Amino acid sequence: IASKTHGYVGADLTALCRESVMKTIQRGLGTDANIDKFSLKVTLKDVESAMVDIRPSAMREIFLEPKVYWSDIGGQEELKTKMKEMIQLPLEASETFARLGISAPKGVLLYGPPGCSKTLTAKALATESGINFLAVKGPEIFNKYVGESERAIREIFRKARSAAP
Amino acid sequence: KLPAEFITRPHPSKDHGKETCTAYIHPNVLSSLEINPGSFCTVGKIGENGILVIARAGDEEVHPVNVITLSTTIRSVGNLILGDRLELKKAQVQPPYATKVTVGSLQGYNILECMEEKVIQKLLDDSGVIMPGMIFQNLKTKAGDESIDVVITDAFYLSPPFIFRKGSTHITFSKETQANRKYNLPEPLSYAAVGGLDKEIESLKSAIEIPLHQPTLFSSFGVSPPRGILLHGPPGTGKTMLLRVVANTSNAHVLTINGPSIVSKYLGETEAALRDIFNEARKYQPSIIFIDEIDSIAPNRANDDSGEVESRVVATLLTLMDGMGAAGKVVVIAATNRPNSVDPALRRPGRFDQEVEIGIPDVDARFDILTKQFSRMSSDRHVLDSEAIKYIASKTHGYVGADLTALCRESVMKTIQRGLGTDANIDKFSLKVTLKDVESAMVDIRPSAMREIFLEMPKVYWSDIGGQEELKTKMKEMIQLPLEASETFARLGISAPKGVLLYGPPGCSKTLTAKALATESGINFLAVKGPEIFNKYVGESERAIREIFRKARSAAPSIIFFDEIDALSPDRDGSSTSAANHVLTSLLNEIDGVEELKGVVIVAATNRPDEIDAALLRPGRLDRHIYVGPPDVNARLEILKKCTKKFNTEESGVDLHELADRTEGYSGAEVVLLCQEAGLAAIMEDLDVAKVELRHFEKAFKGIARGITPEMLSYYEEFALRS
Amino acid sequence: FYLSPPFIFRKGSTHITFSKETQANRKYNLPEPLSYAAVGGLDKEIESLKSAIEIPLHQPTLFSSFGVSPPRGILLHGPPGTGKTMLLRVVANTSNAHVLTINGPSIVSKYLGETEAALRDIFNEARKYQPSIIFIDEIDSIAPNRANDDSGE
Amino acid sequence: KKCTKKFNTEESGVDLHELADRTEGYSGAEVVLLCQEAGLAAIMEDLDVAKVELRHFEKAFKGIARGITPEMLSYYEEFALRS
Amino acid sequence: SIIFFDEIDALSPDRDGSSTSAANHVLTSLLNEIDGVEELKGVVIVAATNRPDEIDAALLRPGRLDRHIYVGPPDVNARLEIL
Amino acid sequence: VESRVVATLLTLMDGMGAAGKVVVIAATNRPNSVDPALRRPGRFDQEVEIGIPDVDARFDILTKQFSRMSSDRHVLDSEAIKY
């Protein structure tokens, strides 16, 4: 249920539980003709029905977080090794960089043919690594924010900087 | 003190006789009005020429000064719902003796219990009787179970007072559903009046009964059941009627927010009134709060930054409503014309989570509404069988139901005017109501809600299409599986196609095939016009897409059809506009996204895929392709079969095979145009003709041209090969 | 009627029974106080809030000796429905210090000096007692941006 | 292999090497689409089916197209060489 | 009644000189008013244009403004009669 | 509450005598938003401009703050403050 509760938040979860309880009560009243509520209990099917019935009120989120492992991608392990040991150094070997010197690469470019799995590989790496991951879609933020795009960019950058590497 | 208004409460005492025709008024009020206890008191609902003379006076200090109790026996006549203000008048008239009285029965049973001991014992205690015939629960029917209600119809002033004495007058037994119409007595609203919203009314009844009648269950559950119900829909759908009927059918207290009347120039007056009404609702356990036109009372704070009489009232009402205890049984009802203008704070699923959606009635719902209206109307004043009502409902599509009431009223006006004009004030019994007058009124007045978010195209069967059944079978096996075999898909894994693209030459029957499949399937069908949403709304197109998608998701799995999508993606030809990019990205992130979207199936039709960007045509979205090209010989022959069946064929000297062979290069629209031209040519000579000759067909064929070039067909073929 | 009817206790008339219950009977509709375990999933945030309330309140002498102007305002910002009001209610219930809240629009009236007088009175009351906590809800509605809206009424 | 793990493989009558050889010109999204089409073709025959044959896979491969032209690949390669 | 338009070429400028929002709005309005759910039996629509080149192809479809009249220059008889 | 206040402030400032040793000083975040009548060099001719302190000024402020805090509660060298 929690995995299928990505969009809901707090009061949304409470409203979903309340809707599930209401659906259970209504189903019991309709079927068993006012039977004792002790035996009605709560079923996962009713929870799913309530979740379908009422959508989250916070669907529009500035940052988007699904967990996926390395078994799903099934890559050559060459690109996987590249992604594993090109960006792990700046986040973990900060002291090594400080003592040795030089500057971090601080940049990754992913260009490829359409229909590839760059996003899937990035999500798998983010799930495998313990570092916090923030993903924001490009066209969906600057298109509808003629002047608020700068504010959103500053907000996401400062949130990423403050909330750990 | 000077109490301008009084509140109403039922009598705690049981049984009948003692509780009826009695009042519980504080002695201080009676002393100010110098009303003797052995006199008659008049109560009126804020006026409306109401008198309602009743006997006896109040006693005991247990009740507050403002509250006055007169039981529901009298309130059932003048529709004196709980919470209505009452007025006391000093003037009174001594009732005279009644005569030639009669008694009826609300139920089907007529003339039962002639001894009527309960009625007989009521004779001695009948003081201050009134003509409208107080409705009694009848208690126990002296074996036989059930209960029979009694009503008296015959016995300036709304109801003339009378004195009932045994022996002087004779009681007559009869049966009538309601009172006589010559006395213009109000008719209480019942659930039978509301029709076409059985699911909606059932949901409202459940959402009212659960927190009110059984609050202890949720109190033990510790869930804090919601106290706010939102009814959002187009105007004229009977939301006010629903609010009124749910109040009438419920014995709990009813409180209605006036809105603008409550709001005054004083800043604290609104807060004081809201606090007073909330305290009154909380003091008595059974009570229902009604807020008519919540949108006007509580507008969007973000849209309009008005802190004068908008922000403060919203804040205070939300704080008061959030602060009530869970053990109480109080329900707040809010009705709005549009949910978008409602403030998002009130739309948060913490205060108004329970939302009831009311839409435009479909064919069966409209037919049910018409039948209910005709049954409510006197049956002897009109004759209309089932087929006539079905035809009227089919011809009635843009009307909302207030439009239906207006149509009925205009039909009555037209019938009266025609009768007086023609027959020179004849008796209205013979005039009756004719379908021709109804059609004339329908032509006269256009629907007030023609602009609709979704269009319900009347049903069409497979016989009209007359296809080769190959494309029909393909569509049957394509999109029916994700709608019915969801469990099979889950067992087998993978994902649903969740997309169908209908690209073909202009003048085809892709829309006709989609409509026929929607008619054949029992699943709900939703249709959206392409150019009618994004072009009209430069910025509101995104909100329209959001609301239509959420409505489709909520109202069960369904198939959505778009007439045109080529104009929806002009990002490649003639530059890219902000609205075009917005609608394109909305379509993309709705078709593919975090949501699995299994039940929802999207079908898109376009005139040419040239105006469609390659982003839309990607694997996993609209992958399936249908040629839906021009009809073949069999389809043209079968569609010409209907035309040949319309008139006589054997003596017309035409053969189906030769007609199909000659007209092989035309499409269905071209075939229909040729048939229409041939029919017009045939009927132009010798006026009406029972048959059409082949010369007319040849003239129609030579006069008109198909207008289709082979290059576009080759382009479509190579696009299909490329895809 | 009555939230809780009064009772009279005397020896011998009634017999005392020993049991164990987390709360009282549900039929008495008594409000249930919210504890720390009521809210979950915000361990870091709740720990930060706990430190930010404990250090200035329980240990004012250390910062007075430091003279580093200890902070007095704690800002809780986030999407609606996250549970900020729950944190405020929990910290109000679990703290024995004085609790004061501002209605906001209700306090604001047509008189320009009435709001100022009410604010002066409420902060004077807060300063009268050494342990005090001030709660303000919907500051943006009460005090919007001056640059965005040029309304000084 | 991950896609076919849902059902059996012993009685499917398909070999791993030829499946990769035939679908060499496709991509991961194309492979997923082909698998979905093959599953749909299998389930539209004889109602529910517990297995899928090679004929369904061949039909799905024939019906669908990769939709990618080598000029984009050459442009990407020359951009990579330039960068 | 019969509805006659003095000019209709300027009503569909969507093909020449770009496509303004108002032009598209009026074009779709006339289109869905001429053809729609309403039968529109008594109402007759007559369209007049100086040059049919400025008319969009989507307007010229069967069932909508299909009938065409050459209405060319008058002959010697008509010219004599009007003279 | 703006034009009248500005006008009366200007009148009062112009009415101050030379003998009287009365001075009025005000602080503003932005000088551009200030009314140019006040900015005219007849009532507010003297102006004190404070900009962004450089590294040396910041270092001096930090050293002064740490000296006020006193070393009994912290230990740091000049290199740390400079960094």
Author numbering:
A (entry chain F): 445 to 509, 511 to 610
B (entry chain A): 29 to 183, 209 to 776
C (entry chain F): 209 to 361
D (entry chain F): 694 to 776
E (entry chain B): 611 to 693
F (entry chain E): 362 to 444
The authors write:
Here, we report Drg1 structures in different nucleotide-binding and benzo-diazaborine treated states. All structures display a typical three-layered architecture, similar to those of type II AAA + hexamers, such as p97/VCP and Cdc48, and the NTD, D1, and D2 rings show an apparent deviation from a perfect sixfold symmetry.
The cryo-EM map of Drg1 hexamers treated with ATP/benzo-diazaborine was resolved at a resolution of 3.8 Å (without symmetry imposed). Notably, compared with structures from other samples, this structure is more symmetrical at both the D1 and D2 rings, and the six protomers are roughly in a same conformation. While the six D2 ATPase sites in the structure of the ATP/benzo-diazaborine dataset are fully occupied by ATP, the six D2 sites in the structures from the ADP/AMPPNP/benzo-diazaborine dataset are not saturated and appear to be partially occupied by ADP. Benzo-diazaborine is docked in equivalent sites of the D1 and D2 domain. Therefore, benzo-diazaborine should have also formed covalent bonds with the 2′-OH of the ribose of the ATP molecules in the ATPase centers of both the D1 and D2 domains. In summary, benzo-diazaborine blocks the ATP hydrolysis cycle and hinders the conformational changes of the D1 and D2 rings, thereby disabling the conformational cycling of Drg1 subunits required for substrate processing.
